[PDB]
């Protein structure tokens, strides 16, 4: 009694732990961020206007989309969306990365306008921003890393460079009142670095959305595993795609010389395929060797 | 010699015509839009009209992403991205819809600021904007509509309402100099309508990106078609998802009572499945009746 669902539990329990573990850190980070929100209010009474609220507001806002997607991803499979809502944490994480591009562009425009209209508080604001951001970096931070932690961490550590830039600009100005042109150019030399560290995340997250082969698995390795069976002769129209970052699905065709005894081949191939990676699901068809064609364009 | 690729040509030639036909209209629209761009330059020599023509700038830009995606979608399938770049026109169209939300939000901010700082050229600018936009509506505008024409059309016809709002505001002010508060509120009553007509596009385009069942096909109808075969007994873990708007893929399990004679079942089921809809591809496994289990967390 070899049911085809026997090996699917390996990728079921591993996923369950990841979403519970991920929900633990964001809730801790959200509360820690909320504590530092009240610090600005306390300082407002005792100067009063500080721009740290804008940076901290989007950070807390970016920590509610990910919790919402993780809360939403637990829904049951339906007639529509047959695979389930398990891809909702890719779209949820993509919106977080988009915020970094939009936020940076706004600050570039404000820094650019300093040229046409040139003009202790700077030091204290930079210290608070560089303190809160650095703390959350450590709090946030074999199977590949979660698609949501890999986005929230980039958001927190991406904006740490902006706090570095203002500290350098304020320190130079406070010691040298002249050469005020360094402040507008200080942001430009550091605004690019935020746009560079978010490139390896966009590429690793965009190929999933167009059902490309995910990192950690190889097309050539999987093809060799199937061919180890004696019965199989050739594989065509192989298909690998990742439903999420650490869940993969397989689909293929298999050609065998013997028209009969096809029941035995399915048990051996499915067992051999699962002995290399925990697959979310696998669907393997069997075609007799007579039905193969030499020069089909779809076959290649 | 019933090759499994025989019926895949039905959904191959139909797709080929759609991308060639779609590339014909955008090129015509881009040139027509370019002609009206030169009208702004001609009027510049002979008055606060560049701002009116700023709307036409993003429209031409929005018509280059779609042509780029259609140019890019023709690339060959590779080891990575096994299915191909055929989903690049969903991501390309999604970015066009996002532009509508960002552009509208900017115009709301400028219209909102009129309250704090109240303050023939309006008529001529509105006439030109309402003329060019209306012409492109007709130029742009059974298988479902293309995912790129359904986005470019919404962009052109979405911003026609903004040109309507300025015409109403200018006409009322020109006749009644007083009651200047109608101009700031004129945009608000018409900025919402742009955000409403773009909702049925976002939903119909987002469920494709999370591999949901596309419009035009039904889960219950497909399940009944398979069961018409005498051999098949039960189907579990059915899976439908749309690679693009008018291309669908099928994957299922089939349980049969007779352990032998499985070669005949595959030919009948595949022929019967293709006689309801032109599928991009189909992969059907066969499982013996013994391997079925009374209950599972995956079968249901
Ligand atoms: Zn099964
Ligand atoms: Zn073929
Ligand atoms: Zn085949
Ligand atoms: Zn089962």
From Swiss-Prot, chains A, B:
It is a multi-pass membrane protein. One of its GO terms (biological process) is zinc ion import into organelle. One of its GO terms (cellular component) is secretory granule membrane. It comes from the Eukaryota. Zn(2+) 3 binds at residues 3, 5, 296, 299. Zn(2+) 1 binds at residues 55, 59, 155, 159. Zn(2+) 4 binds at residues 86, 280. Gene3D superfamilies: Cation efflux protein transmembrane domain. Disulfide bonds: none annotated. A motif (HCH Motif) lies at residues 3-5. Zn(2+) 2 binds at residues 4, 236, 253, 287. The keyword Membrane applies. Keywords: Antiport, Cell membrane, Cytoplasmic vesicle, Ion transport, Membrane, Metal-binding, Transmembrane, Transmembrane helix, Transport, Zinc, Zinc transport. One of its GO terms (molecular function) is zinc:proton antiporter activity. Residues 111-119, 174-181 are lumenal, vesicle. It catalyses: Zn(2+)(in) + 2 H(+)(out) = Zn(2+)(out) + 2 H(+)(in). It is found in: Cytoplasmic vesicle, Secretory vesicle membrane; Cell membrane. SUPFAM superfamilies: Cation efflux protein cytoplasmic domain-like (SSF160240), Cation efflux protein transmembrane domain-like (SSF161111). The chain crosses the membrane at residues 26-46, 47-67, 90-110, 120-140, 153-173, 182-202. Residues 68-89, 203-300 are cytoplasmic. Belongs to the cation diffusion facilitator (CDF) transporter (TC 2.A.4) family. SLC30A subfamily. PANTHER family: CATION EFFLUX PROTEIN/ ZINC TRANSPORTER, PROTON-COUPLED ZINC ANTIPORTER SLC30A8. Each subunit of the homodimer independently transports zinc ions in a pH-dependent manner. The cytosolic pH promotes binding of zinc ions to the transporter binding site. Upon change into the organelle-facing conformation, the two histidines of the zinc-binding site get protonated at lumenal lower pH, triggering zinc release into the organelle. The transporter then moves back to the cytosolic-facing conformation where the two histidines get deprotonated at higher pH, resulting in a net antiport of 2 protons. Homodimer. Proton-coupled zinc ion antiporter mediating the entry of zinc into the lumen of pancreatic beta cell secretory granules, thereby regulating insulin secretion. This is Proton-coupled zinc antiporter SLC30A8. It comes from Xenopus tropicalis. The lineage of its organism: Eukaryota, Metazoa, Chordata, Craniata, Vertebrata.
């Amino acid at each position: 009694k070899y049911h085809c669902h026997n090996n699917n539990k390996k990728a079921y329990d591993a996923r369950q732990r990841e979403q519970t573990f991920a929900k633990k850190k964001l809730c801790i980070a959200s509360l820690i961020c909320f504590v530092f929100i009240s610090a600005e209010i306390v300082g407002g009474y005792i100067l009063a206007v500080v721009t740290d609220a804008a940076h901290l507001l989007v950070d807390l806002s970016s920590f509610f989309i990910s919790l919402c997607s993780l809360w939403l991803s637990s829904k049951s499979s339906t007639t529509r969306l047959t695979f389930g809502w398990h891809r909702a944490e890719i779209l949820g994480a993509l919106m977080s990365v988009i915020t970094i591009w939009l936020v940076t562009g706004v600050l570039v425009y404000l820094a650019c306008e300093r040229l046409i209209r040139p003009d202790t508080v700077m030091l204290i604001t930079s210290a608070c921003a560089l303190g809160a951001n650095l703390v959350l970096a450590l709090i946030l931070h074999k199977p590949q890393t979660n698609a949501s932690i890999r986005a929230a961490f980039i958001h927190v550590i991406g904006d740490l460079f902006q706090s570095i830039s203002v500290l350098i600009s304020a320190l130079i100005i406070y010691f040298k009142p002249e050469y005020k042109m360094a402040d507008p150019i200080c942001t430009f030399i550091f605004s690019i670095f935020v746009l560079i560290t978010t490139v390896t995340v966009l590429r690793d997250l965009l190929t999933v959305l167009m059902e490309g082969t995910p990192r950690g698995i190889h097309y050539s390795d999987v093809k060799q595993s199937i061919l180890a069976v004696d019965g199989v002769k050739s594989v065509h129209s192989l298909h690998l795609w990742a439903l999420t970052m650490n869940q993969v699905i397989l689909s293929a065709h298999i050609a065998t010389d013997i028209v009969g005894e096809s029941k035995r081949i399915l048990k051996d191939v499915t067992q051999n395929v699962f002995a290399r990676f925990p697959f979310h699901s696998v669907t393997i068809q069997v075609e007799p060797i007579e039905d193969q064609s030499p020069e089909c364009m779809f076959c290649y």
